[PDB]
Design a binder for this molecule. Sequence first.
Ligand SMILES: Nc1ccn([C@@H]2O[C@H](COP(=O)(O)OP(=O)(O)OP(=O)(O)O)[C@@H](O)[C@H]2O)c(=O)n1
Lengths: 49, 1052, 86, 49, 98
Amino acid sequence: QESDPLGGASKTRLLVQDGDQIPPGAVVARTEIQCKEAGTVRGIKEGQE
Amino acid sequence: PDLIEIQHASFHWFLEEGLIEELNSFSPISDYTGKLELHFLGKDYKLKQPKYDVDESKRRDASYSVQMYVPTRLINKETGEIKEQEVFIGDLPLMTERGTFIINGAERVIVNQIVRSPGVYYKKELDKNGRRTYSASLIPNRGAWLKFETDKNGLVYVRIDKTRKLSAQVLLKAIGLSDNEILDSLSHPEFYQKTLDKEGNPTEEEALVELYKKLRPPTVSGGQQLLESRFFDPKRYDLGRVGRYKLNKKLRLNEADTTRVLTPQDILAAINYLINLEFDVGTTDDIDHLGNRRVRSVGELLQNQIRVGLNRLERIIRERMTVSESDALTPASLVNPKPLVAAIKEFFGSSQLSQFMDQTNPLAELTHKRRISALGPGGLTRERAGFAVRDIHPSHHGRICPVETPEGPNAGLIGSLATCARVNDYGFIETPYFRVESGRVRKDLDPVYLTADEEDDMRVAPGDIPTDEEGNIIGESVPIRYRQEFSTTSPEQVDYVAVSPVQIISVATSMIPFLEHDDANRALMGSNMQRQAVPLLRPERPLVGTGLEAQAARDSGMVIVSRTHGIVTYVDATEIRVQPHSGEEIVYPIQKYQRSNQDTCLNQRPLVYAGEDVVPGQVLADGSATEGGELALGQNILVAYMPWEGYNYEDAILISERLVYDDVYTSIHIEKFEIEARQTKLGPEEITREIPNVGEDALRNLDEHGIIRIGAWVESGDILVGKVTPKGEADQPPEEKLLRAIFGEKARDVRDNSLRVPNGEKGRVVDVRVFTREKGDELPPGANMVVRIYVAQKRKIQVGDKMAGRHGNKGIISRILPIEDMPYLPDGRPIDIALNPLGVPSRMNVGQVFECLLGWAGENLGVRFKITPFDEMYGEEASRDTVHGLLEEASQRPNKDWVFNENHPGKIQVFDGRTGEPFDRPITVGQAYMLKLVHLVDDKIHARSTGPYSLVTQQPLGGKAQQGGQRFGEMEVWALEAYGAAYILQELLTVKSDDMQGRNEALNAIVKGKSIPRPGTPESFKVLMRELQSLGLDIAAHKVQLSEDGESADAE
Amino acid sequence: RAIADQSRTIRLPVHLYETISRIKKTTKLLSQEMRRKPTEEEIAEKMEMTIEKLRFIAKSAQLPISLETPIGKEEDSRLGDFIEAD
Amino acid sequence: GMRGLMADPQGEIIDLPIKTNFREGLTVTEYVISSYGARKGLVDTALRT
Amino acid sequence: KDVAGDLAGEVLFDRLVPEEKTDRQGNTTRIAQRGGLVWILSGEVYNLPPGAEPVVKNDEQVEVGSIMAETKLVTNDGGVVRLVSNREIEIITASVLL
RNA sequence: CCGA
Ligand SMILES: Nc1ccn([C@@H]2O[C@H](COP(=O)(O)OP(=O)(O)OP(=O)(O)O)[C@@H](O)[C@H]2O)c(=O)n1
């Protein structure tokens, strides 16, 4: 409920439902992290997992 | 709001909820056999009425206490036996309506202690330059401290309070967590697994055996019970409500506030924060920040002392239940109240926090209750007090006054709460702020009371910014404080603003007008001298004030305040009666000539008359240093800043005789004398009229029992209580034997032991109360009767008395002149006091000239101004323009045009009283508010010819009360050695101290007019020789004479 | 027996300790009976001893105080600084 | 004239100027800044003798 | 004294040469041989948790409100999810009542 | 605790 402003805003959402047949070894859910502004991405460094 | 609200709220919290938690953590107790159970019903605890009230407890040297009864219930495990009985548990002294306590006939305050708050704190210590290493510290409210470490290699080391360093994985597996949730809980597991290999990974049973190998036959069940008793048990580890709150706040948890023990999730989160601090995320904490420091008032300290006493009491009850094999007891037999009474009496008698009260004037009484001290048990040591703990922090702005502090060795340790400050429910100090929206100060509702939430978040402006009324903040730059830095921003970016320009200062500093034109050290001196003024006979309000005087007089407690609407029906000097209308007569008692702690008067006078309406909150009676419902510490007198003929040379003071004959600066001081008729082995001491070696007319004021009467005049050496004691040795020398052989002279069996007036201390006897055990009283043991005598005296102003203003301008009166010799004004009015003008620009207190000029304008107008400090927000040179405009308007009166001269504004022409000639230059005259301090010359003059001596050293005693001598210390010996003066130094060390034969020989040679003989070895050197011999050292003096060595005998 | 023979500078005999304990029990029982107004006359009655003897026992039961104890809440004063040599 | 700059109780130098004298009167910010140097003088008098 | 400029972005080195040191305890320290300038090319930086992973590559324009990062919430041996009255992400929880 |  309390979020960081510099990191971003997240979605609470579940891709599976109550009583859903999920296979083992797969994903449960995921979130996004919001982008306040638009533009082109610079950044990503070498060798980082 | 009230100013002593912290004391009132803390004692109300103790009486409502604080004691119930102790009585609920107390119950239930059990025996080792498991057959008896005793539990205390704490919610229905009862308070008896006090045996005596405030004044009858003050004059009897007793406490103002209540009896506290907690009803118990004995349930039985063999049968249905329910035994319920009210049980006395101890004596609790009650807080009075002024917020004080009465312990052994003296008023006492419990000052507020500032300590480190419970919670987790991180710091960054480092090597020579080395590695940035981080350390944690988990502080509970009560219990062991959990600390964490990182070295240069990066090992996470945990330690307990005094032990050596062991590994955090060993601690975590000693708890019982799986290794799954440990590294599944962490954010960066690669940093922690680096420490996993070098330290190793133990099993749950393997970890329990190696803490016992370090904390202390290594066993795992013993170590499991050990760690369960250290951190996870109640009544041996309390994290506290504030500790749970701050630990949830720092580590971002939503753990329930009812849990007051430490959990392994908390240690996992602290390990996570410490690891994440090595990757540059998170914030290290400050130890002097006021968000990490809380205030402990009288509720918490009573709760802790009652916890210790209840631990002793339940140990006693468990031992008494385990020893007794026979059952069917009463609940009043198992409870021994003496450890709880002993703990409460120890807390209220012999604590650093329990202080003898400053009761000089209402301002000192109000300031002592708002003191914030950092010393005491659980606080600080004065030897461990560095410079950083005495520095001023930016978080102190608005909360702790930067000016008011002691000048002695405890400078920066004992602080003062500011004016608008307030302590919240968790113990942190908060200050009110107005909201600011779109550049406009809001001022629509109550303020916010930010509890140091304004450093990292808000931009806060002071309350002296210029602002047009019902409008925005004018100017494009607003001074703000932000992230503990001063800066300037636009008014549309300001979040909060202060509510008052005097929010930064305390009450006594807010008493000072034109504070911004004085130096801060002089403001400190002015506050300190304002707390030292004596209440005068006819108090008078200042012609220039600030506006807090009425609230200070209301919240001191020296003012009878009305409560209901009504009509006053009867007023005399001792009683005000009023029927209320909106058990139909309220009687307000008025105290008459009582004694304070500092031997000053506590007198009240009525203000209302018979037959007028009274609003609730109306002042009915005013106190000793209070008139008109406002604080009145001194008088308004006519100054002239000019030098006299060397009589105001170096801060000396010249005054006139009008301040003597007009009863200005006349005060009342009441001294108290006590004598006990003790029980001696040789016989009982009796208080009688028949005293040996006492003449005829030395017994006129004594009654038939040998005690003085009320209203008698006594001087130095007069007998107050005649007492004798049965001496029984009767070893007479031959001189006395021959003199009693010649002239009769039957030697009596008793000797004189009467109570006499000391040197000085003349006055009138006003109260001769006598306490006797067969009258209904009960005494200290071994004393038959106790007589208490109160002697009052009116002290006029004198040469040698101390005098001060509100701007740190102290001085000693050195000359009292007649009014025909004092300088006079061009209307013929003489000057009351001449102050030296050279003490102003070197000491840099310019506000006294502003105050005297404004007071003289108000004297010539008759208006009694009131000016709040920092008044330069309304314009440039606002104080100067106000003062000179009011002086011009006072000079526009039809008869008084000599008051102001436009050629030289603050000055006028002054004539000489002796010659009639005017002085060559115009002189600043005015009306200043001067004060009379407790430092009078009668309490300072002392002299000794020969008195008592010390036990072992046989040197003269010290102190005025025991006729002691002055100490000739080592620096005085160096000063005499830097001269010649070997004979002065030799007689100062031998025949004036600890050489008894030299003492007797010197006194006999001076009395018979002969030469003083040569002294011998002093007594303390022989004591040192015997002490060095008793240490086991063969030390001896030797003497050489004609090829011979011999050991000398110094004991002779 | 070691408590009653040592641990006190001016030592008291064993019968004095048992008399002090008996006086404590008697005062607590007569305070349970008579709830208010404690009475040394009935304390001396229930112990069958003289009241000045009871005062002697209560006077001998006091503990001594050291001459090196500080008077105030500081280290500037000492109890031996106020004792005059006889 | 002007008061200029104050000093910390340890000898450190503050960052802000005081552009007023005692005749014109200091502000609240300047009074806190002057209180820093007053605490310097008091603590040093109490501790270096 | 530390130079603390208040602007987030990517660091660029102009006329700056580093120097790596070895010390007693193992200190990795960067020294300037000759003093130069340090430039920061401005841009808003978003700190992601270490359990997350970005989707957008090293050069791609982002639209309004588009996805920036999504992580893998992967726990094993679970087939059917059943919840009653909480958020409480859980297991199949085949519990019995006799 | 305060005073110099
Ligand atoms: N802890 C202290 C405080 C004061 N003194 C002595 O007391 C004197 C204090 O002088 P005082 O009249 O209190 O202050 P002034 O220096 O005269 O300054 P002002 O006129 O502003 O009061 C000092 O010279 C010093 O010798 C001391 O020995 N130790």
